Design a protein around this ligand. Sequence first.
Ligand SMILES: CC(=O)N[C@H]1[C@H]([C@H](O)[C@H](O)CO)OC(C(=O)O)=C[C@@H]1O
Length: 472
Amino acid sequence: GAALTEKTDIFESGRNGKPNKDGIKSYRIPALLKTDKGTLIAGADERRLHSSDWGDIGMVIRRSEDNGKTWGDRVTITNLRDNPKASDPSIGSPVNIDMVLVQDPETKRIFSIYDMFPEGKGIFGMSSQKEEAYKKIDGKTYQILYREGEKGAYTIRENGTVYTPDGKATDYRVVVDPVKPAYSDKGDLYKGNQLLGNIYFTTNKTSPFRIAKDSYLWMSYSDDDGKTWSAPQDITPMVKADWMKFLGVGPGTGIVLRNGPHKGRILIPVYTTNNVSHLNGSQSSRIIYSDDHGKTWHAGEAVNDNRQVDGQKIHSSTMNNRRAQNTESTVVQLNNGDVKLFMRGLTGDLQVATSKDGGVTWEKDIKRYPQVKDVYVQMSAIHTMHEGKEYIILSNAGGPKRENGMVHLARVEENGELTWLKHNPIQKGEFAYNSLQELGNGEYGILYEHTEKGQNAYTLSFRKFNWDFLSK
Ligand SMILES: CC(=O)N[C@H]1[C@H]([C@H](O)[C@H](O)CO)OC(C(=O)O)=C[C@@H]1O
């Protein structure tokens, strides 16, 4: 009655600290998406040198047209070239990290949203002081460029031409429309046809220009079921406020609202930090959305904005409360229009926020569910129906550490509350960061990180199971 398949390594990592046959050491941060054509897209972070949250990392995906039985070749969405002059090769490359997948059910366009950092240690190597990244000139927005020795703000305008702080064009230009595989030529700084450097390089630079050391949010899309992908789109300035230090997505799979006055809206989990307590107490979860099928993006209010904690109000931009944080999350919409946000936190159990206006604002009280343990690791949840009954599946590590992956089943009551029914294990051993997707015909897929036999950091594996496996 109940069946669960053996694990299928989609992105097989190296061993005992060595690279695999392809020269890749580690894989991390999975994302699973079932497309309109029934295809399964497995995304991940290709860490070519080590497992840490920085370095030469590429955004790759694999496709399956047989519900996960077989998988095609690796398809790279983005892979910025590393700095050939960096002193420490482990931290001498622009970074891309933490992918989120989602498809618009009207246009059939598939989106991929991920973080982007210039050369350095990613989120752990952020310049303490702020550097304005964009400038608004007569309506249009341009990315700022800083010149060595100078204080003014150059800008990247039409055709990638660099403009002086006084608004006059220069002989320098940026590669704004890359053409190389994986778009590895993005940010290349030219002076005519002579390549000088890259605006994303921060050390031992060969060119005089660079962008701000900040957190950026990029987006690539595919109009052919994930076969080919667009060049990266910089959506940072559409959603990132000036007070935000870090702005990154909660890895996994987004959703499209299927009912209510905001049907068609796309939701992408993200979380931020302020300049008050950076990652010590400002980690706040929020959501961005697009009401025009991915053309423009907008930022909702954070769950922590105007939240009452221990008799005091707080805001994501000013808080310094370790335990009140909420990071990487996963979003789900109920049949009653409400939106639930399952957030990674530090309370030891599951925290859930609710929204009645499409994820823009959140309710007063954050619900906690001790039945589901949260060991402070990523999680993914999806909505599913069965014989006219509303359910929600959520998966995450069961404990004691990032171990023993679990699959929790909950009933969506008429009032909007959740009743947790069963908790079945899906993988013994190491288990961190997973992504759920419904496959149809009562079948469900899951992509998750796991190691065994001395495998490096995480190998991402895939499994299927049915409703009978879910109901104890
Ligand atoms: C952008 C980034 O670095 N994301 C990382 C995330 C982050 O460090 C933490 O959420 C800070 O709060 O956590 C971890 C982790 O293994 O726990 C992995 C992610 O790759």
